[PDB]
Design a protein around this ligand. Structure first.
Ligand SMILES: [Zn+2]
Lengths: 21, 27, 27, 27, 21, 21, 27, 21, 27, 21, 27, 21
């Protein structure tokens, strides 16, 4: 979940690249 | 950039900045 | 909704508002 | 359009999306 | 106003339409 | 996609809602 | 406030910022 | 309206405040 | 506008509305 | 910086303009 | 160029998102 | 500056970081 990897826990912007379509 | 967890509309903002017109799933 | 173009982060914001906690797919 | 609490800028954006150029009042 | 009806209370499409000119 | 429908052209709320989860 | 044009969401956002609690009438 | 004054043309802070409550 | 504390995004948006393409240092 | 002046303290129009380049 | 131009308020928002309270130079 | 780099043309995330204080 993007929320666990980014809201519940700290994530970097580069990590979001894996969530693009 | 050394930001902590992104929540709510802030996470959405970050997704668009990185993904752009590639699209993304917000779920 | 109204008769106007929704582009860029404005379109993503529209999705965020209309879909709420259900989330959405920007594709 | 999901029912939810809309505050601040999001409420302003919601009114613009729904009303558009009809114009609107914010109070 | 609309903030009391939509932010403090729960908002809805129908309510938003009522504040259009 | 949603950008062709809502940004290039004008879309309705119904169309927009089609992209909600 | 200054020089540039303000349209759509940006105009309503500028109104929200400038007027604040007083509210405003987008017309 | 405000659109004609601030979008079509360039308006000043004073003009923008004309629309506050 | 309204004499009150301007923080975060509120402050960044206020500086853009006031300074525009004149630029500014947000520190 | 401007953050300390406008966020921690109060600042008006001519205070923000002082920070434009 | 799936990623579009960042101008006006959108460029300032992106800078704040990336830089944070530490600050940034809009020039 | 960053404007000409990101608005006129297209820039990347690392170019933005170049303008952080
Ligand atoms: Zn815009």
């Amino acid at each position: 979940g993007i929320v666990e990897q980014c809201c519940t826990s700290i994530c970097s912007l580069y990590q979001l690249e894996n969530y693009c379509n | 950039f050394v930001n902590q967890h992104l929540c709510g509309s802030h996470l959405v903002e970050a997704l668009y900045l990185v993904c752009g017109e590639r699209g993304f799933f917000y779920t």
